């Protein structure tokens, strides 16, 4: 396909259900993959402070396994996720990510679609605090919301793109998006956003949220099939 579509997982076993779909990459919100999937680029994540301990070592294995890309903290703007002030993110980014700039493309901490001061407000606070010394190849962002709130999806992604470009970061990954509701409500959403994401040159890579919910009892759900074929 576009080569932008990702497999976001917890159970590495379930990526087989997506074999031969237009997938180039995977991540699991962890620094280590828990296994191997052939022909797809695993992307390590520095989730938050709990990972600082191993991050050196973890970035080493992954670059050593040919990983082109590294991701930073998960939802520092949400208290039960990374839960990090923009200032502490800037510090820990510069410290723990910037060092791999020569060997890998670095993805920003991934914000929620929460309104300022969460979301892209936190990104701007982080981008301000970074003070042009954070080495960032791409912004990571997330959007969760009802299936019929599709417009808001696209505005958010554009606003993330606009925000990144103002700070000289030329692309975003949408590392999580989820159009909520019953199976049909979820399909139709993917029919609208997947083509839009695939041609929107502001979006380098994306992942619907997520593999483990798109498979059930070892079988693709109907949402699974749509994500695989559209
Ligand atoms: O279970 C998938 C993955 O979820 C992460 O947290 C998510 C958050 O990233 C966002 O989507 O909000 C939802 C709703 O609460 C959270 O579940 C976890 O950080 C990660 O460790 C987990 O593997």
TrEMBL record:
Keyword hit for Zinc: no
GO BP, sorted A to Z: fungal-type cell wall polysaccharide metabolic process
Q: Keywords for this entry?
A: Signal
Q: Name one GO cellular component term.
A: fungal-type cell wall
| Pfam families linked to this entry | Glyco_hydro_cc
**Residue ranges of domain Asl1-like glycosyl hydrolase catalytic in the record:** 6-227
Q: Which Gene3D superfamilies match?
A: Glycosidases
Disulfide bonds listed in the record: 130-134
Q: Does the keyword Signal apply?
A: yes
Protein's UniProt name: Asl1-like glycosyl hydrolase catalytic domain-containing protein
